[PDB]
C-alpha cells in the first residue's frame, strides 16, 4: 500500500495540513469533540452530509453509512485523504477491523491514529 | 526530537557525509538533477526503488509514494538517515507541511535544508 501512510496527528495538526493542502477530510458528524473544533475554528460553517469545502475540504458522513459504503463513496471521488481509521469507534469497530476495511481504499491517503504506538499496531493490522 | 538534528549542506556534501558514514540517504527518483549527480559520481550504478548501496547507501523512491509511507517504510529500516525533507517539492509540499510529517521518523537523522535561513525556518516549523 504505498499511496497510504499512517502518522500519529491531533486534530489540530491534521486541520492544518487539510487547510494548506485541500486535501480532503472525512469527519463523522457525531464525534461531538471533532465538529466542536470544527464549528469555532470556522465560524459559519454549515455542516452538512457529503462534501463541504469551508475552511478545509471535509467529507461529511453519520456512521449509518457503513464503512464500505463510505470507501467506495471515497473512492469514486478520487481525492487524496487526511482521515483516521474509518470505522474505528464510530462503528463499534476496534483498531484491527477497521484497518482490514481501509485495505479498500484506492485513493492516497493519511492516515492518523492515537499514539507512535498505534501506528505500528496499525500498519501490522493493516499488512 | 533529540534523534533528529538540522543542517545546511548542498548534495555533494550530503553524498559525502553518506559516502563516509554509510548512513541511508533517501532519493526521488523523480528528481532528475539529484539522480543525475549520482549516476555521474557512483558511475555504473543501477538505480531502482529501494535499497540501493553503490558508493553510498540510498533508499531510492517514487514521488508515488505518499510521504507517510515513505516514512514508515523508513522506521521500519531502523537505519540512521541522512535526508531532505520529505515530500517537500516532490510531493508539492512547501517546507512546513514536510516538517510535520518529519515529526513521525522515529529513527535517528540529519536532515539537510537548502539554506541557512531554512534551517531556522524548518526547526520552528518541525517544533
Redesign the interface.
Given at each position: 500500500?504505498?499511496?497510504?501512510?499512517?502518522?500519529?496527528?491531533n486534530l489540530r495538526?491534521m486541520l492544518?495540513?487539510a487547510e494548506?493542502?485541500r486535501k480532503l477530510m472525512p469527519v463523522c458528524v457525531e464525534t461531538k469533540a471533532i465538529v466542536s473544533t470544527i464549528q469555532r475554528k470556522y465560524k459559519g460553517i454549515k455542516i452538512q452530509e457529503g462534501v463541504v469545502d469551508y475552511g478545509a475540504r471535509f467529507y461529511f458522513y453519520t456512521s449509518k453509512t457503513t464503512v464500505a459504503s463510505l470507501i467506495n463513496t471515497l473512492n469514486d471521488l478520487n481525492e487524496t485523504l487526511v482521515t483516521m481509521p474509518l470505522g474505528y469507534v464510530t462503528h463499534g469497530l476496534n483498531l484491527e477491523e477497521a484497518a482490514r476495511y481501509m485495505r479498500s481504499l484506492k485513493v492516497?491517503?493519511?492516515?492518523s491514529v492515537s499514539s507512535?504506538d498505534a501506528?505500528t499496531a496499525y500498519?501490522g493490522y493493516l499488512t
Open positions: 500500500f504505498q499511496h497510504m501512510g499512517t502518522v500519529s496527528w495538526e492544518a495540513h494548506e493542502t492516497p491517503a493519511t492516515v507512535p501506528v500498519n
